[PDB]
Amino acid sequence: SLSTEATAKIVSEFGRDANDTGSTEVQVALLTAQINHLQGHFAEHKKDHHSRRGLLRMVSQRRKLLDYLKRKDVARYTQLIERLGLRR
Amino acid sequence: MRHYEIVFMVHPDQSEQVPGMIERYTAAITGAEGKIHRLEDWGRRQLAYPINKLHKAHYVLMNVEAPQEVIDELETTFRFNDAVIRSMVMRTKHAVTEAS
Amino acid sequence: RKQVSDGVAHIHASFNNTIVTITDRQGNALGWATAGGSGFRGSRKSTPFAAQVAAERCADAVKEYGIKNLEVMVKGPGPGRESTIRALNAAGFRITNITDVTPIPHNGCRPPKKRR
C-alpha cells in the first residue's frame, strides 16, 4: 500500500508546505508516483482482469486533472511538466 | 525493520543439538540488523498426530525483529533443515514478551 | 488363533448393506458378517434387524479366537450404527470402548451420485 518515505519526499519538493498537497502540481505527482510503482505489476502476472479497473480509473482521473490545469494555469502546467516530466 | 514471529519446531533427536542451531540462525540476525523479543523453550511436549512414526516434538519460538529479505532466505533454510520440520513466519504489528 | 483379545470389529454400514469385518489392531482379519450375506435381499437389508442378524453372525466366528474387551470402530452411519453396536453389547461382549473413528474427507475428490 504505497511507499510513504518516497511520496512524502515528493510533497516536500512540490509543496510550499508539508500539509499542502491540495494544489494541482502536487496531487497529480502523487498520482504518477502510484503509476511509477504500478508498472511493476503490469509487467508481470498477465491475468489481472481485476487490477485492470484500477488502471483505467487512475488514468482517467489523471488525464482530466492535467486537462484543467492546462485550461487555467499554463504557468504551473508548463512548470509541472518541466518539474516532474509527466508529459512523457 | 519488520516484526516477525518465526515459530518453528524440531524432533526430540535434534533437541539436544538445536540450542547450537538457534545460535546458528540468531547469528545472522545479530550481524544484520536484529533483536529478539521472545525466545521460548517449551521442551519435548506432546504433539498432536505422530510425524510418520514418533510423536512429541521440541517447540522453539523466536519472535524476532529482522529484515524481510533475510527471513525470506532464512525460511528457505528452514524448508531444508533436518531439525526444523514445520515453521510459520508472520507479518508486522506488535512484539511479544510473555506468552506464559 | 492369533491369540487376540482386542477384536477390532469394523462396522461399516453403506446404505443398503451392513458389512462388519472383525480384525486385529495390526489388520489381521478374522472374518465377517453381513445383513446381505444372511439373506434379507431388498429393503430388508436396509433394516437394522438384518443388521441385528449381522451383529450375531459377527458374534460368532470368534469362538475360536476369543475377543472379550473388544473395540467397536464404527464408520458408515447408514442402516447399522444403532441395533448393531447394541447387539454386540447384547451378545455377551464387554466393549472396552465404542469408537467412531471417521477420517472424514474435506470432500477433496468427487463422490458418486444418487436419488434424482
Binding site: - | - | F15, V74, P77, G78, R81, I85, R86, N89, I95, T96, N97, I98, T99, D100, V101, T102, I104, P105, N107, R110, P111, P112, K113, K114, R115, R116
Partner: protein, 65 residues
Amino acid sequence: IKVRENEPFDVALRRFKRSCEKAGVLAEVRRREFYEKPTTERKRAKASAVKRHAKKLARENARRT
C-alpha cells in the same frame, strides 16, 4: 467420538457421535456435488427460521382466546 465409561453403562452410549455430526457430513459427501443446491434450500429454510420468531411476535401482543 470415543465413548468409554468404565462401568456404569449397561448401554452403548453413542450420543456425542450424533451430537457431533453423524448425518451432518453423510448427507454432504454421499451424493453428487451440485454446488448451488444448499444455497437455494437454505433460502426457504431461513425465511421459515424467521417465521417462528414471527410467531413469537405473534403470540406476545394478543391471543385473547
